[PDB]
C-alpha cells in the first residue's frame, strides 16, 4: 500500500487505513521515527506530534493537526496482524493567493503572477480558450487579439484562485 496525500499548512489530514478486523496495537512512523502508537492499551505520541495527532483505535487511521512543512514526509503504519506495509507520502502545501494580471501595450505582452502557493501552476485563458500553463509564479504571453478578457488561474494540489481582466490598449 502507498498513498499520496496533500495537506495545507496549519490544516490537518487523515491517513485512512482499511477498516475491517480491529487492531489491537498500531504504530505510525514518519520515515524511521515514531509518530504515535496504540501499545499495550495505551496511547502516546512523540516529538512534534504530541498534542496534535489523533489515532483511531479501530482502524488505526492517523489524523495530524496543525500541519507544518516539516511534516512533509513518508509515513508508515504497522500492526502485528497486518502483513503488508501502509505507506503514505504527505505533501504540505501553502495555498495560492489571488493572481495579478498586468500588461505592456507596446509589445502586446500580458503577464500573470501570483505571490503565495507551493508548486503553483498558472493557467491563462482568453474567452473560452486555454492559451497556456506554466509551473511558475509568473507567466507572460504575447497576445494576438483582444476580443475577450483574459483569465489567469493559479492552482496547486490544495487550492486555486483566479483573476479576470480586460486589457486596455490603444487600437
Ligand atoms: C481539520 O481540517 C478540516 C478540513 O480539512 C476542517 O473541517 C477542520 O476544522 C479541521 N479540524 C480542526 C480540529 O481544526
Ligand atoms: C499551529 O502551529 C503554529 C506554530 O507553528 C501556531 O499557529 C500554533 O502553535 C498552532 N495553531 C493552532 C490553531 O493550534
Ligand atoms: C516588452 O515585451 C517583452 C517580451 O516581449 C517583456 O519582457 C517586457 O517586459 C515588455 N515591456 C517593455 C517595457 O519592454
Amino acid at each position: 500500500f502507498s498513498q499520496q496525500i496533500y495537506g495545507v499548512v496549519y490544516g490537518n489530514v487523515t491517513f485512512h487505513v482499511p477498516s475491517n478486523v480491529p487492531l489491537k496495537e498500531v504504530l505510525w512512523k514518519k520515515q524511521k521515527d515514531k509518530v504515535a502508537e496504540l501499545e499495550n492499551s495505551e496511547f502516546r505520541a512523540f516529538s512534534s506530534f504530541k498534542n496534535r495527532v489523533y489515532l483511531d483505535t479501530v482502524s488505526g487511521s492517523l489524523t495530524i493537526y496543525n500541519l507544518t512543512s516539516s511534516d512533509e514526509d513518508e509515513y508508515e503504519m504497522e500492526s502485528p496482524n497486518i502483513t503488508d506495509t501502509m505507506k503514505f507520502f504527505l505533501y504540505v502545501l501553502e495555498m495560492v493567493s489571488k493572481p495579478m494580471i498586468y500588461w505592456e501595450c507596446s509589445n502586446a505582452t500580458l503577464t500573470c503572477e501570483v505571490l503565495e502557493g507551493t508548486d503553483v501552476e498558472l493557467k491563462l485563458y482568453q474567452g473560452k480558450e486555454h492559451l497556456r500553463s506554466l509551473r511558475q509564479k509568473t507567466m507572460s504571453y504575447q497576445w494576438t487579439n483582444l476580443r475577450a478578457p483574459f483569465k489567469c488561474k493559479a492552482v496547486n494540489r490544495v487550492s486555486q484562485e483566479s483573476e479576470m481582466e480586460v486589457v486596455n490598449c490603444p487600437e
Side-chain angles (χ1 to χ4, degrees):
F1 185 106
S2 213
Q3 247 235 105
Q4 299 273 116
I5 307 282
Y6 303 97
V8 189
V9 199
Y10 310 140
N12 62 71
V13 286
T14 292
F15 295 153
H16 294 282
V17 170
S19 169
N20 35 284
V21 52
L23 286 64
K24 256 84 207 321
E25 302 177 280
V26 63
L27 176 62
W28 277 95
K29 285 170 170 177
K30 174 185 198 278
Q31 271 308 42
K32 282 296 157 77
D33 311 294
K34 287 206 277 183
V35 163
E37 74 193 15
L38 281 179
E39 187 177 280
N40 299 311
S41 297
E42 308 186 295
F43 164 83
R44 87 185 34 94
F46 310 85
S47 322
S48 47
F49 298 91
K50 269 123 110 67
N51 299 307
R52 58 161 188 133
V53 300
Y54 162 66
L55 191 38
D56 189 10
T57 65
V58 176
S59 59
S61 284
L62 179 69
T63 292
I64 304 176
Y65 301 96
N66 214 37
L67 294 172
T68 165
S69 4
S70 33
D71 289 340
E72 176 157 321
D73 221 331
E74 199 217 0
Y75 291 71
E76 320 88 28
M77 189 236 79
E78 44 175 295
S79 196
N81 211 0
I82 269 167
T83 348
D84 26 31
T85 81
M86 291 272 336
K87 274 133 85 267
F88 292 80
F89 328 60
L90 167 72
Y91 300 95
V92 177
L93 293 86
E94 141 188 335
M95 281 176 315
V96 299
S97 47
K98 182 209 203 25
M100 269 190 28
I101 295 174
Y102 59 95
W103 58 83
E104 173 51 57
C105 290
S106 76
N107 51 48
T109 302
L110 164 324
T111 298
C112 175
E113 68 159 53
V114 66
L115 186 58
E116 303 179 60
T118 309
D119 215 17
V120 176
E121 188 167 287
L122 287 179
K123 301 175 118 102
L124 187 67
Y125 309 80
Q126 172 165 43
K128 80 195 257 269
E129 184 159 309
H130 172 35
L131 303 173
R132 65 172 305 216
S133 293
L134 190 65
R135 185 125 255 153
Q136 282 205 180
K137 279 191 181 179
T138 188
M139 175 171 70
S140 293
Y141 167 89
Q142 259 227 315
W143 69 77
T144 71
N145 78 88
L146 296 178
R147 292 191 292 278
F150 287 96
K151 173 168 174 264
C152 184
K153 179 191 303 198
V155 47
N156 68 14
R157 298 280 192 160
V158 302
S159 66
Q160 77 162 275
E161 306 283 336
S162 57
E163 177 58 284
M164 186 166 266
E165 298 297 342
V166 177
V167 174
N168 169 44
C169 289
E171 272 187 17

